[PDB]
RNA sequence: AACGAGACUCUGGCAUGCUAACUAGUUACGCGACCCCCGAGCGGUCGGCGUCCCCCAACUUCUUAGAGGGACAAGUGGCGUUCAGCCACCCGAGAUUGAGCAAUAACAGGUCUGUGAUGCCCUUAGAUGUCGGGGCUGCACGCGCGCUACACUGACUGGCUCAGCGUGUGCCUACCCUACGCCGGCAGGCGCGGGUAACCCGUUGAACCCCAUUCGUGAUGGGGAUCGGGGAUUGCAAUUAUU
């Protein structure tokens, strides 16, 4: 188990949601392909992570305001 | 018109390519009867799908299988895994969904790697042991 | 003139020629600011591109030295006569050339000069020339007959993972004195990430960054515009 | 029938008896002093071992592409217990197999064909499949 | 029968578990009856995963022990086919009901353990899981047949079928029902 | 005449290999020489398993090194002139080529 | 803010998707040849068994190796400040298949017998630099790493039947891997041929295992230490026994 997300993910995840808020869905696959086009993530496994956290944030942003 | 669909199964690098070609009965392996494949104590095992599903599913095909790889044991699981999937593929292609969906429920009930495959193969040894985990004895005096 | 050796053995013998030469040259061109080679066999001809910073001292007056070097190789490895052809090359940007930077520090030291001020002088050059960071070590004796170590470091460095093969170069050179031996080591970090040569790859090494462009505008209102 | 269909433990035990009736096989004198392989520690119990081994010789030639005196030995070789030293594989005798194959060739059930190996004569192939059905006639396959 | 495998000849119907405690870790017939005891090699990667696989297979696994017999699971199945055969001729039953009694009669009811006080041995009585009982009972009786055939003219098959009789009907001529009662006799004392 | 001429490539770098193969398959198919594709052969392992410690002392350690060679070959059948003309040129990296008169 | 952790590299696990193959296969016939009626029939044909024949056949599932995709705690139910996360389940390859790389500072750790790396000291013609012979194997004893065993879940003798990582002469200076034929109980000898190697050895026709005899609880036929005699191979030479 383990697999607690690092800061490199959480730093860019916030940034990518702020400046491309409109492009986001709430599906994994759509939010992946957007991150692939609006930026380059130099790995493939890293890309699959940053999408999933961008998805997980976008769930909460449709409720009350996030403090990050 | 000629009908022929092929499948394979694997377990621990033992491939068994079992083609289902139109015909009637007479399943073989290597041009020999399945009745005499040689440990002949596991004879009930490779027979298991044919016996359990009935022999009236095996009345529109001639199946022959070629094998290679593995030991005496792992080959038996390979030929079983292929013939199970071979039968399915014949129905998937020339007959409707509800025929083979039924057959899928039966096999996967007593799943034993008939329609799936183990991902387990040997791990690579590292120094300081005769095995991958086991180590040489350590002495302090 | 045949036959020819196994394909497995073909690469080993090439490696032996690539390596032997690279230590042959380093014992003659040390003072001329040696920095490596790059061999190339070409149709019915050998090219040996003898990279050094100052081609002046390599050439000599009337090309004497280059003529000595070609005649050596023509006898030593038993090359067919007249096939060998040397060429020289000057490198631009000399502070990313760790091998030459280390061997220059050597002659500065062996010339008779203090260690601290010498280490600082080489440091700011390799930093100025471009580099994320850089490092120097001097391990051996000084101020008595027990050894010590002296690290001089500035900027960024990496030590782990596969980026070590790309984004740093490292050199080792022994220098003698009247009391024992002193070890020099120089480790320098390559800076390119935007583009070009392309030499080292574009992603960042240790923390692999997300390269992020930005655009964001709308002024849209409904209208029909015929074309 | 083809020889594939039947059991092979049964095959040899009727084929060995067949030959000895018909006056076939001129045997070597040495047959009662012969260890039979380098990795054995004893002579065979059997007193008609020559007849038994010629059966197994002719069968393998039916299956595979045929090969010489070297290959027959490699098929028969087994494990060698070297005592206190760890066991290893080794090959058995040669000069026995060299008498076997030449004795068969005297009857023209084999013959030196092209591509580096003896191959079994059509007369030989006739006689195998002839007694192959005799096995099924006997017990009941 | 045409929709549920026997054992190659032995019914898994008319087989009961006669405790309410030890069922759901003894099962053999819900759909878990198969022609042979073997697996693809999934048996454990979770704690609950151990339970599911048959009792007859578990018996075959714990039969091959002590160096020279490890990795010879096919040789092991030879001994089990003779066992049921000998049990059926010898007494005349559904020979699985023999085995189920033999397992249930050999599992302990209370057990002891260690506890550290004053740097000296003290013991404490504690209870035991149903899963523990099954694991223990399979261990104990297999040790009997292994022990007996270590210098006897009798084969291990003969020894093992004898050991399931004396367990299935308690009589204290088995290695199991002896060793069961030893533990409980301790558990009474220190409690 | 038109002879089955085989252009064998051999390398240790998968980028350097493959793009130089592509160049020769374009330039061939461009001129309709009826070129036959790459036949990628099994990549072979040179292994060297030796001590990591000179003058053995301390915990016993080793080091696996490996070199991976690569072979692949494109079969052409066309006049030997235009092949030997175009082949030897347009190669940037250190990658070997061996031309054969006939094989089939 | 930086180094280490992670990220990274390699490897395993998922492709009837993509790319393409007589130094890789399969299928399909064309087949003609062999074989047995073995099954319907008659032996032909239809079906079955492999091999030769295979192509200007068809294909790339199997084999090979390249480009790509796929797994993210993604979805659901619990739990947590409802944050960071944790537990169960669906799909399925579950968020851990195994390795490589690895910080600061330190050790009077090992290595002058790897180094034409190196300080100082010593020795240098009656040499610490070359040939011949002997020794590092010498045993009343102590310890460590292992190998083979104490049997019937076995040994013995026949019979059946399955694999993978590699490696190989043309190199160092004289040397490789072996098929096939012949001779010998065996070790081995001898005559020919192939292999720069997905091409020849090798469709690596391996062991445990599997099937049938024999032995019978006996330091036994379990165990194979010790030891006598004889035959071969390597080498310039085999004694303190090379194998």
Swiss-Prot record, chain A:
Region of the whole protein represented: 1 to 68 of 135
Residues modified as N6-succinyllysine: 19
Keyword Glycosyltransferase: no
Protein's job: Component of the small ribosomal subunit. The ribosome is a large ribonucleoprotein complex responsible for the synthesis of proteins in the cell. Part of the small subunit (SSU) processome, first precursor of the small eukaryotic ribosomal subunit. During the assembly of the SSU processome in the nucleolus, many ribosome biogenesis factors, an RNA chaperone and ribosomal proteins associate with the nascent pre-rRNA and work in concert to generate RNA folding, modifications, rearrangements and cleavage as well as targeted degradation of pre-ribosomal RNA by the RNA exosome.
Stated name of the protein: Small ribosomal subunit protein eS17
Primary localisation category: cytoplasm
Coiled-coil region: none
Subcellular location as annotated: Cytoplasm; Nucleus, Nucleolus
GO cellular component: cytosolic ribosome; nucleolus; ribonucleoprotein complex
Domain of life: Eukaryota
Biological processes, Gene Ontology terms: translation
GO molecular function: structural constituent of ribosome
Family, per entry: Belongs to the eukaryotic ribosomal protein eS17 family.
Subunit (UniProt): Component of the small ribosomal subunit. Part of the small subunit (SSU) processome, composed of more than 70 proteins and the RNA chaperone small nucleolar RNA (snoRNA) U3.
Keywords carried by this UniProt record: Cytoplasm, Isopeptide bond, Nucleus, Phosphoprotein, Ribonucleoprotein, Ribosomal protein, Ubl conjugation
Curated annotation (Swiss-Prot), chain B:
GO cellular component: cytosolic ribosome; cytosolic small ribosomal subunit; nucleolus
Function field: Component of the small ribosomal subunit. The ribosome is a large ribonucleoprotein complex responsible for the synthesis of proteins in the cell. Part of the small subunit (SSU) processome, first precursor of the small eukaryotic ribosomal subunit. During the assembly of the SSU processome in the nucleolus, many ribosome biogenesis factors, an RNA chaperone and ribosomal proteins associate with the nascent pre-rRNA and work in concert to generate RNA folding, modifications, rearrangements and cleavage as well as targeted degradation of pre-ribosomal RNA by the RNA exosome.
Entries under Pfam families matching the protein: Ribosomal_S9
Superkingdom of the organism of origin: Eukaryota
Subunit structure, as described in the record: Component of the small ribosomal subunit. Part of the small subunit (SSU) processome, composed of more than 70 proteins and the RNA chaperone small nucleolar RNA (snoRNA) U3.
InterPro entries: Ribosomal_Su5_D2-typ_SF, Ribosomal_uS9, Ribosomal_uS9_CS, Ribsml_uS5_D2-typ_fold_subgr
Organism: Oryctolagus cuniculus (Rabbit)
UniProt protein name: Small ribosomal subunit protein uS9
Keywords for this protein: Acetylation, Cytoplasm, Nucleus, Phosphoprotein, Ribonucleoprotein, Ribosomal protein
Family membership noted in the UniProt record: Belongs to the universal ribosomal protein uS9 family.
Residue(s) carrying N6-acetyllysine: 55
SUPFAM superfamilies: Ribosomal protein S5 domain 2-like
Database matches in PROSITE patterns: RIBOSOMAL_S9
MF annotations from Gene Ontology: RNA binding; structural constituent of ribosome
From Swiss-Prot, chain C:
Principal subcellular localisation of the protein: cytoplasm
Compartments, record wording: Cytoplasm; Nucleus; Nucleus, Nucleolus; Mitochondrion inner membrane
SUPFAM superfamilies: Prokaryotic type KH domain (KH-domain type II), Ribosomal protein S3 C-terminal domain
Residues that bear N6-succinyllysine: 132
Residue ranges annotated for the KH type-2 domain, each copy included: 21-92
Domain of life from the UniProt record: Eukaryota
Cross-link (Glycyl lysine isopeptide (Lys-Gly) (interchain with G-Cter in ubiquitin)): 90, 202, 214
Pfam family, one: Ribosomal_S3_C
UniProtKB keywords: Acetylation, Apoptosis, Cell cycle, Cell division, Cytoplasm, Cytoskeleton, DNA damage, DNA repair, DNA-binding, Isopeptide bond, Lyase, Membrane, Methylation, Mitochondrion, Mitochondrion inner membrane, Mitosis, Nucleus, Phosphoprotein, Ribonucleoprotein, Ribosomal protein, RNA-binding, Transcription, Transcription regulation, Translation regulation, Ubl conjugation
Chain positions found as N-acetylalanine: 2
Cross-link Glycyl lysine isopeptide (Lys-Gly) (interchain with G-Cter in SUMO2) placement: 214
Residues with Asymmetric dimethylarginine modification: 64-65, 67
Residue(s) carrying N6-acetyllysine: 62
Single Gene Ontology BP annotation: translation
Membrane topology: Peripheral membrane protein
Activity: how regulated: Endonuclease activity is inhibited by MgCl2 on apurinic/apyrimidinic DNA but not on UV-irradiated DNA.
Modified residues (Phosphoserine): 6, 35, 104, 209, 224
Oligomer status and interactors: Component of the 40S small ribosomal subunit. Identified in a IGF2BP1-dependent mRNP granule complex containing untranslated mRNAs. Interacts with HNRPD. Interacts with PRMT1; the interaction methylates RPS3. Interacts with SUMO1; the interaction sumoylates RPS3. Interacts with UBC9. Interacts with CDK1; the interaction phosphorylates RPS3. Interacts with PRKCD; the interaction phosphorylates RPS3. Interacts with PKB/AKT; the interaction phosphorylates RPS3.
Annotated NCBIfam families: PRK04191.1, uS3_euk_arch
UniProtKB/Swiss-Prot annotation, chain D:
Entries under Pfam families matching the protein: Ribosomal_S19e
Modified residue annotations for N6-succinyllysine: 140
Keywords, in A-Z order: Acetylation, Cytoplasm, Host-virus interaction, Methylation, Nucleus, Ribonucleoprotein, Ribosomal protein
Keyword hit for Translocase: no
Residue numbers bearing the Omega-N-methylarginine modification: 64
Molecular function terms, GO-annotated: RNA binding; structural constituent of ribosome
Compartment(s) of residence: Cytoplasm; Nucleus, Nucleolus
SUPFAM superfamilies associated with the record: Winged helix' DNA-binding domain
Modified residues (N6-acetyllysine): 20, 108, 112
Listed SMART domains: Ribosomal_S19e
One GO term describing the cellular component: cytosolic small ribosomal subunit
Chief location of this protein within or outside the cell: cytoplasm
An individual GO BP term: translation
Presence of keyword Nucleotide-binding: no
Subunit architecture: Component of the small ribosomal subunit. Part of the small subunit (SSU) processome, composed of more than 70 proteins and the RNA chaperone small nucleolar RNA (snoRNA) U3. Interacts with RPS19BP1; the interaction is direct and mediates the integration of RPS19 in state post-A1. Interacts with RPS19BP1.
Entry function: Component of the small ribosomal subunit. The ribosome is a large ribonucleoprotein complex responsible for the synthesis of proteins in the cell. Required for pre-rRNA processing and maturation of 40S ribosomal subunits. Part of the small subunit (SSU) processome, first precursor of the small eukaryotic ribosomal subunit.
Entry similarity comment: Belongs to the eukaryotic ribosomal protein eS19 family.
The protein's name: Small ribosomal subunit protein eS19
